[PDB]
Amino acid sequence: NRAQKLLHYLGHVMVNGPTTPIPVKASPSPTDPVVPAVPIGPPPAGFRDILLREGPEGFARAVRNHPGLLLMDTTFRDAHQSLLATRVRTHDLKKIAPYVAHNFSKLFSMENWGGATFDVAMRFLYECPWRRLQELRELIPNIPFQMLLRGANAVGYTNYPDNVVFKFCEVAKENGMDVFRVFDSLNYLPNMLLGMEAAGSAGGVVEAAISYTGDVADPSRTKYSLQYYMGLAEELVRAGTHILCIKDMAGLLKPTACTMLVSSLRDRFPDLPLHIHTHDTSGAGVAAMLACAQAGADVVDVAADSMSGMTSQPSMGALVACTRGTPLDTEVPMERVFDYSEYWEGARGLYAAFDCTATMKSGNSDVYENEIPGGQYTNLHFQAHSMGLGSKFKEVKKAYVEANQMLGDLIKVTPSSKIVGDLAQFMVQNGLSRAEAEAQAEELSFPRSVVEFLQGYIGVPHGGFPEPFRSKVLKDLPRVEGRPGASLPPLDLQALEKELVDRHGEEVTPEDVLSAAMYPDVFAHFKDFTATFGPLDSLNTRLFLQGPKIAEEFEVELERGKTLHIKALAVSDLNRAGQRQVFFELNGQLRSILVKDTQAMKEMHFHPKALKDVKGQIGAPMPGKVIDIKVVAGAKVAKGQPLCVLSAMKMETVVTSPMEGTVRKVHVTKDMTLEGDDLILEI
Amino acid sequence: NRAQKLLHYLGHVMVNGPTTPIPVKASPSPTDPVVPAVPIGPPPAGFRDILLREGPEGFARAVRNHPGLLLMDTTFRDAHQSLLATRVRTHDLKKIAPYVAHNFSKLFSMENWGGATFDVAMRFLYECPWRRLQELRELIPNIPFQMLLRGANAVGYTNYPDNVVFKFCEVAKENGMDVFRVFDSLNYLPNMLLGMEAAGSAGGVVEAAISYTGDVADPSRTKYSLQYYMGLAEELVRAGTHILCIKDMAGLLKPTACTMLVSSLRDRFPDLPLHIHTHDTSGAGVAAMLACAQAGADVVDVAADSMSGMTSQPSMGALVACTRGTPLDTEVPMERVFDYSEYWEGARGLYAAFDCTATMKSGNSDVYENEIPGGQYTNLHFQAHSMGLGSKFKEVKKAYVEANQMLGDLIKVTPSSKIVGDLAQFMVQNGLSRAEAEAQAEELSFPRSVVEFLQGYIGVPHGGFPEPFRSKVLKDLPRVEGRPGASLPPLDLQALEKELVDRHGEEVTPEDVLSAAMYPDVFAHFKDFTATFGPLDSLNTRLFLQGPKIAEEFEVELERGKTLHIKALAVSDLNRAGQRQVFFELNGQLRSILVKDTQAMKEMHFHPKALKDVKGQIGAPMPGKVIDIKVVAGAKVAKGQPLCVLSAMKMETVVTSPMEGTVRKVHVTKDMTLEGDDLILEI
Amino acid sequence: VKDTQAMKEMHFHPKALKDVKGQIGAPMPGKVIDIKVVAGAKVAKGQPLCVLSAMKMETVVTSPMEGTVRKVHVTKDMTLEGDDLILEI
Numbered sequence A, B: 001n002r003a004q005k006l007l008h009y010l011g012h013v014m015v016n017g018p019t020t021p022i023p024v025k026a027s028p029s030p031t032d033p034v035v036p037a038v039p040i041g042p043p044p045a046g047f048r049d050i051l052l053r054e055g056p057e058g059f060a061r062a063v064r065n066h067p068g069l070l071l072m073d074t075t076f077r078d079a080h081q082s083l084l085a086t087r088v089r090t091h092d093l094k095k096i097a098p099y100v101a102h103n104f105s106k107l108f109s110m111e112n113w114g115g116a117t118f119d120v121a122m123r124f125l126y127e128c129p130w131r132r133l134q135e136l137r138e139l140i141p142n143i144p145f146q147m148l149l150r151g152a153n154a155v156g157y158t159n160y161p162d163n164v165v166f167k168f169c170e171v172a173k174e175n176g177m178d179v180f181r182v183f184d185s186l187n188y189l190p191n192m193l194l195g196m197e198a199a200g201s202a203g204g205v206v207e208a209a210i211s212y213t214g215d216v217a218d219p220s221r222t223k224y225s226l227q228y229y230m231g232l233a234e235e236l237v238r239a240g241t242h243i244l245c246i247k248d249m250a251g252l253l254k255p256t257a258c259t260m261l262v263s264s265l266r267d268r269f270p271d272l273p274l275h276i277h278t279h280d281t282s283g284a285g286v287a288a289m290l291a292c293a294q295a296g297a298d299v300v301d302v303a304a305d306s307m308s309g310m311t312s313q314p315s316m317g318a319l320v321a322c323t324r325g326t327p328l329d330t331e332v333p334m335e336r337v338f339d340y341s342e343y344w345e346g347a348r349g350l351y352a353a354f355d356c357t358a359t360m361k362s363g364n365s366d367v368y369e370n371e372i373p374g375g376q377y378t379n380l381h382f383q384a385h386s387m388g389l390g391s392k393f394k395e396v397k398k399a400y401v402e403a404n405q406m407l408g409d410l411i412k413v414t415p416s417s418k419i420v421g422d423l424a425q426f427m428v429q430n431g432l433s434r435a436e437a438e439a440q441a442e443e444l445s446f447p448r449s450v451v452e453f454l455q456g457y458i459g460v461p462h463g464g465f466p467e468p469f470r471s472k473v474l475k476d477l478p479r480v481e482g483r484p485g486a487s488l489p490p491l492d493l494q495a496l497e498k499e500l501v502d503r504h505g506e507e508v509t510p511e512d513v514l515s516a517a518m519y520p521d522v523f524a525h526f527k528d529f530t531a532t533f534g535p536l537d538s539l540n541t542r543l544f545l546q547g548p549k550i551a552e553e554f555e556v557e558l559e560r561g562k563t564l565h566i567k568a569l570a571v572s573d574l575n576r577a578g579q580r581q582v583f584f585e586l587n588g589q590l591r592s593i594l595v596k597d598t599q600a601m602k603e604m605h606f607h608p609k610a611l612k613d614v615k616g617q618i619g620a621p622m623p624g625k626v627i628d629i630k631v632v633a634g635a636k637v638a639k640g641q642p643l644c645v646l647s648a649m650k651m652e653t654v655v656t657s658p659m660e661g662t663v664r665k666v667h668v669t670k671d672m673t674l675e676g677d678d679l680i681l682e683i
Numbered sequence C: 001v002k003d004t005q006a007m008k009e010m011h012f013h014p015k016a017l018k019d020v021k022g023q024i025g026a027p028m029p030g031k032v033i034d035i036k037v038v039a040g041a042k043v044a045k046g047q048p049l050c051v052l053s054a055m056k057m058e059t060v061v062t063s064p065m066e067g068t069v070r071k072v073h074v075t076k077d078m079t080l081e082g083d084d085l086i087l088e089i
């Protein structure tokens, strides 16, 4: 009963379309991604060998004592979150993972988990994220792995109790995660210290990421000054971080600001490794990374050349070529870069339904005025499409700016940007301005994320909440102040394990109860879907998003040894219950799949009958047209008296009543062409 | 008889499709480009005022004594040649020209003519290029104009005699061109001096552009060394150039090479303005331009942010933002940049049939190994599509590299890149390798551009031709050595004016005879097309490329005052001659257009008859099937003897001959189901 | 079950077979614009025979060796493909 669920999925996708929401109506390309040649044998030695040999402090001293620029690949997580709405599957990553393991041994790390990959992998792709992590950990053994962990937000959207995040880092380090980049939205310091403690006690390398916004080189803006970042970095180094990081999530770091900030961090902490992360939204990413690498940055984040650009990271080939021959040489050969970007061009062609290039064709300097991050940009375009706002995204960006100013000049990264984007979609859908919605603040019903933020369930912003808005929206809802994670009670995780073993099965693991603690309803619907259709992980992307075509024999190997040569021969028409039939040739023998179509129902309405059991139910003895009614609705009549007269083709009849009674209502109007045995009078 | 030609064009585009070749099957977007608000009144003062007030040497001293970086916009010429196969029309440029005139007064110049715009404007767009030049010269009066002129190649593909290029620069300066950027493909010095003399004697500013290739920072490559560029620049300054320029047409300038070359040119010539032109193909354009502006470059080339990126120039917003607050401040406000790029995003949506983003979604570092320029990239993809090679463009790029090495390491820019691309398409279409085609060099038939190059009709490459290849391909064809333009006789231009006035009309101007000297057959076919369908310049792009839709009233104003409200009501089916009929509502009254469909013909073939006038033409008296022939082809028979027997539905007949004669041939085979009165025997 | 109508629809120009050097075919598609040979005489190698034009490209056909021109297989302005025969020789 394994190929039957797969054929049910394939027929359901053929007849009804894909169960994924599709924002751009397009098909996957017929061209396959070209995987290059990989030398057979064990891969080279990398930085994970020195990590497992001498710990995180020796890893930090090795990355600090490396002559030249080090790179981190973000193609597996942040490139397709910025460009393809986080929709790239584990199949296309596993096809290129041995090439990366053989040829990119000199990388610092590789971000391939965390962010929005958790929620999208369970929600839209029907995959387990721990399964992707384990598969790529077997495939790439020589390069350290890196995950993007929020403060007390783990991989969710709100603050969690401490035991859940500690257990989350414990199990993620158990599965294979090496480097943990911990950041917070509002730069709220105890949430950062909590996330750093949870990441450090699990045994992993800690990368304390400071969220950057504004401009430190512009003295006109004084809220997030250079001294603010210097004090934040001083306290984060005082908590025992191993690598400091600057997360510029919108792409706002300019070369002068880069030189100023990295030189301040280098002459304040002379032996601490600096990592810079930026997006190339404004079009100045490679220039900013060259400014950082000359100012004293150690690791910078890149992506493959076909998977970089618009809202993504800077390009790997441009960073390799722009440092060739310099003292900052990365000594990576450019031909391996060419083959890797060749693969990702072929693989990006498969995801044309979620692609950024259907709307945005080049960069945009207006990110200097709306400050939207890139992953949020593509996921926000999808979310605005799925709520009817799919043709008003410029107004969503304008209300984005308005909602940033209205909520008190927040630092927008994931959670806070999700709050500002929810408020922007609310202000677009209800036509409200800034002052127009602050005047009606005590009347309107803001969404759960905005009201939950104004309560303070994610933390406290810099300079405090907007207190007139917080007084007008929150009437008497509880304002839990201080730290949200030090107030909420710990979830009994063995109770949740006991709650989940009696619903799905007995292969429920701690990874599953962490998936259900982070997302209860998404894990429930994911488990129901994978009960119905089974492991759709090992399908290719054209098969997953499009199904097969007629008379084209395709090969599916679900598990080890179990191979299936499947043809799709015909699709019938609809049955009595609105169901179609699909005909397959599975392993050479004919099989049949019955799938419910989803559009051919809910089309019926007509006039009711005249029920014969009651003599006071006067109906039409013959069809035609009501030409005159002789009764007043409310009086009573005798039997034999005329009530209504009807006419048909050369025929006219007068309706008589069979007995007495009070005329309740005249059910028929004037000149209503009714059928036979249809009710004209209730009596 | 003016609206009738327009309606004939609109019906021809509706029924038959557009007469333009369409490489990507897609439609223009229903969204219109959003033109911003323009303040009413005269535009500000720019650099053309100081140009017209004190000449080119005062203009050169004003651009040399400007504190800060100056920008040149390339959105009108080089952006859409790099990205949209030079297909942007004058309508979409005229819609934004007053905004540029009001808001971008501090520009150096604006490249809006030359390059591939001449050939494409006559050939695929049915426009006069002088008409575009005159329209934009009325619309933008405050900014100097810039054109890209080849050496002795004017705006063509081969060397021309001196009088034609001198007359070309004379008439272009007469029409409104201010700055002339003169470059040569092989860096052949007398062609450069000829083009500089023709541009300088007309009265315009001379920008001597050195074509860059390779890497001056890499000492392993020694052919185009730094001293080679220094000697070339020394001789070009010795000929009296006003502004020097570095044309990096493939995007190969790195920041270290930029700093080295611009600092060498600045400490060799301390008062000469330097202009740098680059493409952003590798992804390091903004970094290279910041390196040039800090090294001492005066003007750099940018484009609008939605019209920059992949094979185009660096982005205007990134250059404005990355120099904000520095001593290199451009003092351009970013909001005007946002509105300009907003317009060009809306306008780029209209050209989806020619867009780069259908195949290439991001940059490419492989330009470091194939060295293809960007305008050539998009036009070469179109040319490979129109010769059946549309699905083998990676092989075209591989043979590009092979043909570069095979022809002796050329500098690839326009003419030479057209030669290398023609050779690459030839080697792809005939399966040849490099040594495999050099072994068969004396056998094969190379195209006219390759053989014409090996003769030396464009000039002499650096280090000489490949002499085994030049000996094997050229058997005894004339090798005109020295300068090609000092050998060819001058064209009698009054004779060509007399040749063209007796064919089209009496509104033939010197601009038209220069168009016919540069392109005879393209101007002839263009004049026939504009005789048939008239001035299609004032149509919008959706109307030009797609036609109208049914029951959607569209407004066309061809000329001053003459306005037309046109509806399209119906299209009939085909007539006897294969023609359809289109029904329009022109100005409120019903009109009819008869257009020839182009596919519903050339479908007929069957067996010939048996002609009755000759008694020796024995045919079938009734249909059926030949079941047996009783004659030997070659002998003669008597009348009454059986020849063939035929059978039909319950009927069988024996064929007798009417008279004697020699059986020439048995025209029917065995069991051929033939009709009645169809020939069975010639006799 | 065999359908009975969806067959007997194919015809086009024949190829130029590569095994014989006297089988001169089109190295690139386009349009025959001029033929420089008389059908019946013989030519030397390197002499022009036919000229063809495509999208911004024009090529002159040369013969690889000698031999008698049997027949000019292509007519005037016949838009033919690549590797399609123009001369039997």
Ligand SMILES: *C(=O)CCCC[C@@H]1SC[C@@H]2NC(=O)N[C@@H]21
Binding pocket: A086, A115, A116, A119, A120, A375, A376, A379, A380, A413, A414, A415, A416, A417, A418, A419
């Ligand atoms: C669900 O659609 C996955 C994406 C949800 C929003 C994601 S979470 C990370 C990015 N930041 C943000 O505010 N939105 C993006």
Ligand SMILES: *C(=O)CCCC[C@@H]1SC[C@@H]2NC(=O)N[C@@H]21
Binding pocket: B086, B115, B116, B119, B120, B375, B376, B379, B380, B413, B414, B415, B416, B417, B418, B419, C056
């Ligand atoms: C015709 O299709 C116009 C484009 C023809 C080739 C053009 S000319 C300028 C560019 N350089 C080059 O070699 N090809 C492009």
